[PDB]
Design a protein around this ligand. Structure first.
Ligand SMILES: CC1(C)CN(C(=O)NCC2CC2)C1(C)C
Ligand SMILES: CC1(C)CN(C(=O)NCC2CC2)C1(C)C
Ligand SMILES: [Cl-]
Ligand SMILES: [Cl-]
Ligand SMILES: [Cl-]
Lengths: 697, 695
C-alpha cells in the first residue's frame, strides 16, 4: 500500500510529499532531463543499494553488503572482518575482483513502443511481453546499432511493470573498479548478528565504505593502477541535525520483489503451502541441529553457519504468517478483487472477473504438486545434507566402464566427495536430521508420490526410517572416508549403480526436477491473467495509490521517523542509543561483544557534534517508509534531501508488507548517519573521509 | 521507597497527601479505633488478604488459595482446572489447617524490652532477637491468662531496626475460612511459569474465601454451626479504575528485606549465594530440560521439579542484574562511609568498629559459605538420590524381638516415596553426573563428603562409573534390588551400600558446614544493632524503613510503567486484548478459557471496561513490595480497593536490598478484571451483591 514508487511517479506524489514535510524542489530529487539526487544512488554489487557521499566518488553501503570484500581482503595478520579497515590514504584503498556499481543515468517510459512491437502477435498466449531476451532485442533496437561501443560504460535495459502494462527503458552506467575504503569491526557492523536479525529495537552500526574509480575522463574502466577516483555528477550532503519523532524521511533504492496484486487464493496458498511447510520442516531440522550443537562444542563450530542460514527465512515465514493471521491480508485481497469485479460488471467488461477466476483455478489445480515440491525442497533438498552427496555423471560412469580416463573420473568424484564430507560435515548429525526429516516427509507424502528410493522404507525396511538411513551410510561408497577409498582403489560402475546414497540422491533430485517441470507451466496463465487484473485495477482506481510490484529497479518511498506498539502495553520508540549497545554487551557471546574503543567513547561521552541535543549518542532509528530486500544500504533522506541514515533491515512484524503494507507495525530499520560518522571518527580515526564529505550543521 | 510501620503513618502522612492521598489519617490507621487496617489479614501464614463485605468475604491471590482449591479437587469436580463458584453460602468448602490473622492492636514496647534486657549480663546474648525470650516478655506484659480472658486473641513481640525498636502485636486469629470462589487455572495462573516475575502481565491472580466464626463473631474452629463473620471494617470496591500517575497504596505482610547490608555483604550475596545458585541450577535445569524434551513421559514426571528450581533461579538472575547495573554495592559503601565520617566527627568510633566487624566476619566465613552453597545447590537440592533412604539407629537395631519386618516396612515406605511415580533413575543419574562433575571441580578432595573421595580413589576420576556403581550395587537402585534386600536383610549390606554411604556422607558434610557457619551470624547481628542505631541517630527514621519481618506495613506510590531497556516502554496497564494475543491452544500455560474468549469477542464488559471500551487486566505501581505481599489490597487515594498485588517484575527483585525507582514495580490484578471474572465467567452474582461497589 504505502509504496515503492517509480521515479516518473514523483510528479503526481510531490504535493502529498510536501504536505508530509518534504522541503526540497521536485527536480532536485529527480529530473528526467538533468542532474538530481537520484544521480547519487547506485545499485551496489548487483543486490544492495549504495550512495555517493563526496566529489571524489566515496560510497556508503551496509557492512553486510560489503562483507564479502572485507572478508576476501582479511588474513590472520590483518583481520579486517574482526578489527575493521581504515585506509589512511587513497593509494591504500583495496581493489575488489567481481565488484560493480550501477548508476541509473536515464529512465524513459517506452510503453507505447513496446506495446506497438508486441502487436506483431504470432500467439496471443506468448510470454515475450515478459521475456528478458525479447525486451533486450527492443532495447537494442531503440538504443541503436553498436550502442555499447559508441558509449563505453553505458548499457540499456527494458523492464515490464504492473504485470506488463507499463515498460521503462533504463540507461545504466556501470563502474567495476570499486575499492574498499573503510569498515567498522564486525562487533559494530553486525552487533546484533543473527539474534537481532529482523529485530527492532536495533543497535547495529551496519555500514561499510567504498570508492568508485574510473579512467582520467571519469569513464568506466576495469581495475588499473592508473585509475583515478570518480568525480561524480551528484553526491549526498551529510546532515548532523539528526532526527526527531514524526520527521519526514525518504529512501531511494532497488527493492527486489513484492506481491501487492496477489489474489486471496494466492495469499491462502502462500500461508498453507509455502510458509506452513517451510516453518514445519525448518523447525524439525533446526531442533535436531540445535540439540547436537548444544551437546558437542565441536558440532556447534561445524553447524553454526548452517543453523543460522536456515533460521533467516524461517523467521521471515513466521513473521509473514503472523500478518496473514492477524492483519487481514487475505480479506483485503478479497475486497480488492471483489471491488474490481463489481466495477467490471457495471462497465459491461467481464474480462477482469474471468482473470481472477483463471488465477483461482490455476492455484487450486497446482495445490498437490506445489505441496509436494515444497515438501521435498524443505524436507530433503535443503533438509538433508546427504541429498547433495556425489552423483556420478554419464561421462564419469562411461569413463569407469578401459583408459587413463578412470583415474580422471575418480579424481573428479573424489573432489565432490571431499566437498560434501568437508570439515563442517558430521555424518552422525546428518543421520539424526535425516531420520526426523524423513519421518515427517513419509507421513505427508503418500507412497505413490515418493521419490523411488524412499519406497524402500516400507518395502525393505518395514517402515524403520532409522534402519533405512543407517543402511545408506553403512553400505555407501560416500558413507565414510575409508569406504570412499576402498571404492576408489577398485571402482566399478555396478557399485555406483546400486549405491544406496547415490540412489537416494538421484531419486530425490529426479522427483524435485519432475515436480518443478510439471509446476512451471502453471505460472504462465497466472502471469497473463495478472496483466488483465492489474490493467483493470489501474483503469478503475488509477496509478496513484497502487504502486507497481518491486522488480529490482530504482524506486522511492517516503514516510516518517516513528516507533510502534508490537503488542499490548509495549511501545518501541523511534530511536536507539549507544546506551542500548552497552546494555546488550556480553563478553562471552561473540554476537554481543563491544569494541573497546567504542566502549571508551561511550564512557568519556566523546560524542563531538554527533550526539543529540540531550547529550545521548544515537545509533539507529526506524521509519514508516516501505522497503524490502534490495533496499539494504539505501540512503535515507531528510525533508531537505540530506543523508540522515542508511537503511539496513526491517522488523519481522512488517515482513507481510511485501503483500500488504502494515502502517501500525512495518518499519525500515536504519543506521543513524551520526553514528556512522562517530565510528569513522572515534573508532577508525579516518579524518580524511570526514573532510571529503560535505557535512551540513 | 519503603515498607513502613503503622506507627510511622503520622510522620509520612504529609508526604502521602502531597503525593495524592485524600483519606483522613485515622481512617487508614487508627491506633485506638476502627480503620482500614482492620480489613487486612495475614492469609494462611504467608500471604496477605482483605475483607471485602460485611459477611466476611475475603479476596487473596489464586496462588495463595491454590492448595485449598487443589485439596477440594477430584477427577469429577476439578476446581483447579475448571474454577469453583459456590452458588450459596452453605456450598462454601471448609479447609483444614487454614487461618486468617487480624492485627487488632500494635504497641511500641521498646523502653519495656530494653529495660528487661538490661538484666541479661552477658553482653553477647542473643535473647534480644529470641522469639522464646520475646514471647516471655509479651506474656508478662499481656497478663497471667490473657488468651483465656480474651479468647481468639494472642500477643507477640518482634524486634525491628536490628533490635533498636520493639512492637507488641495483639492478633485475632480465625481458623474457619471457607473456599467461596476461584477462576479456572487458565485465568488464575495464565502466564504460569513463563510469565513469573514478568511485566507486562495478563494473569487474573485471585481467589475468594469467607471467614466464619461463632454466633458472637468470635474465633472458632470448623463447625457446621459457624456463621459468617461480620467484620468491624471491609474495603469498598472502586469501579473508577486507574490512570497513569494515580496515587496507589498497599498494606500487607512483607517477609524479608536486607536494606542495611554492608558493601561486603552485597559482594558475598553476588559472588557466593547468587553465582552458585545460578551456575548449579543452570546445570541441573539444562539436563532436566533435554530429558523432558526427548521423552514426553519424562516431561510429565519432571515438570513441577523443573518449575520449582526455576523460580529462585530467575530471582538470583534478576538480583545479580541489579548488583551489576544499579550500583547496589557502591550505594551501600557510600551509606557506611557517610556513617563512619559522622562518627569520626562526633568522637564515637563504635559505628566504624561495627562495619569492620561485619566485613571481617564476612571475609572469615567465605570458604565455608562457598562450600555450604556448593553442597546445598549441587547435591542436597541438585541430586534426587541424595534424599534416598538412610536407615535409622532403631532400624539398624532390628535387622541385627522379631521386628525385622517392622524395620523393613518403614525403610520400604521411604524407598517408595524416593522412587515414586515421578522419579526417573536414568534422569537422576544424568543430572548427578553433570552436577557432581561441577561439584568435584569446585570442592577440593580434602573438603569433599567422604564418599565422593571414591571418585578419584576408586573410579580413577570417572564420575559416570561412580554414579553407575551407586545404582548397580545399591538396594535402592531399583525395585528388584530393594526386594532382594527386603527378603534377606542385613545391617552389613546397608553399612556398605553405595547409595546409603553417598546420602549419609553428603548430609554429614551439609550439617557440619551449617554448624560451623551458624556462629558467624551472631557477631553480624550484634554489629547490625550498632550500625542501624547509628544510621537512625544520624539521618533519622523517615527515609530509612525497618527491614521487613512478616509484620504489617504500608507502602505508597503511583500507577506507572517503566523503560526496561533502551527504546522500550512498558505502560502502566495491560488489557484483555493482551491475553488474546498470548493465546496458544497447544501450550497449557497459554490456554484461554472459552467463556473468557467469548466475553472478549462480544465485548460483554458491562461496567468493568475503561472509558475507551478496552477491558483492563492488570496494572503496575511504584509501591515497594516483596514476598509476603501476595494478595495485598491496593488502594485508591480514597482507600477504595482498585486491585490485588500478586507479583513484582524481575528487574525490581534487587529492591529487597535497594529500592529501584526506575525499574521496580508491584504487579497488580485490576479489581475490575476480578469482578468481570466473578460475573461473566463464574456467574456468581451473590458475591457482587454482597460487596459495596462504588461508582
Ligand atoms: C518473532 C520472529 C519472527 C523473530 N524470531 C526469532 O526467532 N528471533 C530470535 C529472537 C531472540 C528471540 C521469530 C520467533 C521466528
Ligand atoms: C531476566 C529474565 C526476564 C529472563 N528470566 C528467566 O530466567 N526466564 C524467563 C523467560 C521469559 C521466559 C528472568 C529472570 C525472569
Ligand atoms: Cl472484456
Ligand atoms: Cl497495520
Ligand atoms: Cl474484624
Amino acid at each position: 500500500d504505502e509504496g515503492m514508487w517509480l521515479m516518473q511517479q514523483l510528479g503526481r506524489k510531490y504535493a502529498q510529499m510536501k504536505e508530509r514535510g518534504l522541503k526540497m524542489k521536485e527536480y532536485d530529487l529527480y529530473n528526467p532531463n538533468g542532474t538530481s539526487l537520484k544521480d547519487a544512488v547506485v545499485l551496489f554489487d548487483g543486490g544492495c543499494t549504495g550512495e555517493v557521499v563526496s566529489d571524489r566518488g566515496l560510497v556508503l553501503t551496509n557492512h553486510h553488503c560489503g562483507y564479502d570484500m572485507i572478508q576476501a581482503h582479511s588474513t590472520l595478520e590483518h583481520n579486517y572482518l574482526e578489527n575493521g579497515f581504515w585506509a589512511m590514504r587513497e593509494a591504500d584503498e583495496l581493489p575488489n575482483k567481481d565488484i560493480s556499481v550501477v548508476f541509473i543515468d536515464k529512465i524513459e517510459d517506452v510503453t507505447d513502443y513496446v506495446k506497438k512491437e508486441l502487436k506483431a502477435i504470432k500467439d496471443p498466449n506468448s510470454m515475450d511481453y515478459l521475456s528478458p531476451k525479447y525486451l533486450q532485442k527492443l532495447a537494442d533496437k531503440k538504443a541503436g546499432k553498436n550502442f555499447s561501443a559508441k558509449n563505453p560504460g553505458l548499457s540499456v535495459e527494458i523492464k515490464a511493470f504492473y504485470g506488463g502494462n507499463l515498460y521503462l527503458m533504463f540507461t545504466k552506467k556501470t563502474y567495476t573498479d570499486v575499492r574498499l575504503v573503510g569498515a567498522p569491526p564486525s562487533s559494530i557492523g553486525k552487533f546484533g548478528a543473527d539474534t537481532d536479525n529482523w529485530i527492532w529495537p536495533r543497535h547495529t552500526g551496519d555500514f561499510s565504505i567504498f570508492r568508485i574509480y574510473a579512467d582520467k575522463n571519469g569513464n568506466p574502466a576495469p581495475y588499473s593502477e592508473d585509475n583515478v577516483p570518480l568525480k561524480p555528477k551528484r553526491f549526498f550532503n551529510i546532515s548532523l541535525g539528526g532526527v526527531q519523532e514524526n520527521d519526514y524521511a525518504m529512501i531511494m533504492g532497488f527493492p527486489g520483489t513484492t506481491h501487492r496484486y496477489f489474489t486471496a487464493s494466492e495469499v491462502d496458498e502462500w500461508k498453507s503451502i509455502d510458509n506452513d511447510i517451510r516453518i514445519r520442516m525448518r523447525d524439525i531440522r533446526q531442533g535436531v541441529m540445535l540439540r547436537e550443537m548444544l551437546a558437542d562444542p565441536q558440532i556447534k563450530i561445524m553447524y553454526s553457519a548452517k543453523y543460522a542460514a536456515s533460521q533467516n527465512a524461517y523467521k521471515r515465514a513466521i513473521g509473514a504468517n503472523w500478518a496473514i493471521k492477524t492483519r487481514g491480508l487475505r480479506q483485503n485481497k478479497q475486497a480488492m478483487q471483489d471491488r474490481l469485479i463489481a466495477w467490471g460488471a457495471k462497465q459491461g467488461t467481464p474480462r477482469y472477473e474471468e482473470a481472477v477466476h483463471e488465477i483461482d483455478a490455476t492455484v487450486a489445480k497446482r495445490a498437490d504438486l506445489r505441496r509436494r515440491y515444497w515438501m521435498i525442497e524443505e524436507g530433503i533438498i535443503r533438509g538433508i545434507e546427504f541429498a547433495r552427496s556425489p552423483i556420478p555423471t554419464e561421462d564419469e560412469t562411461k569413463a569407469l566402464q578401459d583408459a587413463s580416463a578412470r583415474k580422471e573420473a575418480i579424481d573428479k568424484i573424489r573432489t565432490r566427495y571431499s566437498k560434501f564430507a568437508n570439515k563442517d560435515y558430521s555424518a552422525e548429525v546428518d543421520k539424526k536430521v535425516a531420520v526426523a526429516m524423513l519421518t515427517e516427509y513419509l507421513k505427508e507424502i503418500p507412497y505413490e508420490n515418493l521419490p523411488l528410493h524412499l519406497r524402500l522404507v516400507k518395502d525393505r525396511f518395514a517402515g524403520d526410517v532409522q534402519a533405512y538411513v543407517d543402511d545408506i551410510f553403512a553400505r555407501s561408497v560416500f558413507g565414510s572416508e575409508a569406504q570412499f577409498d576402498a571404492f576408489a582403489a577398485v571402482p566399478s560402475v555396478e557399485k555406483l549403480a546400486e549405491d544406496p546414497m547415490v540412489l537416494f540422491a538421484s531419486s530425490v533430485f529426479d522427483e524435485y526436477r519432475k515436480l518443478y517441470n510439471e509446476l512451471r507451466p502453471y505460472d504462465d496463465p497466472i502471469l497473463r491473467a495478472q496483466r488483465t487484473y492489474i490493467a483493470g485495477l489501474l483503469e478503475m482506481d488509477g496509478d496513484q495509490d497502487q504502486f507497481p510490484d518491486a522488480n529490482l529497479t530504482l524506486r522511492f518511498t517516503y514516510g516518517q521517523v516513528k516507533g510502534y506498539s508490537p503488542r499490548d502495553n509495549v511501545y518501541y520508540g523511534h530511536q536507539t542509543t549507544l546506551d542500548g549497545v552497552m546494555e546488550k554487551e556480553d563478553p562471552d557471546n561473540w554476537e554481543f561483544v563491544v569494541d573497546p574503543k567504542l566502549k571508551a567513547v561511550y564512557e568519556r561521552k566523546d560524542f563531538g557534534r554527533y550526539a543529540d541535543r540531550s547529550g545521548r549518542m544515537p545509533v539507529a532509528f526506524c521509519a514508516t517508509t516501505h522497503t524490502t530486500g534490495g533496499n539494504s544500504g539505501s540512503p535515507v533522506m531528510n525533508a531537505n534531501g540530506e543523508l540522515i541514515g542508511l537503511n539496513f533491515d526491517r522488523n519481522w512484524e512488517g515482513v507481510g508488507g511485501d503483500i500488504q503494507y502494515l502502517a501500525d507495525y512495518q518499519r525500515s530499520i536504519i543506521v543513524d548517519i551520526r553514528y556512522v560518522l562517530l565510528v569513522i571518527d572515534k573508532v577508525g580515526g579516518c579524518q580524511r573521509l570526514l573532510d571529503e564529505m560535505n557535512i551540513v550543521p
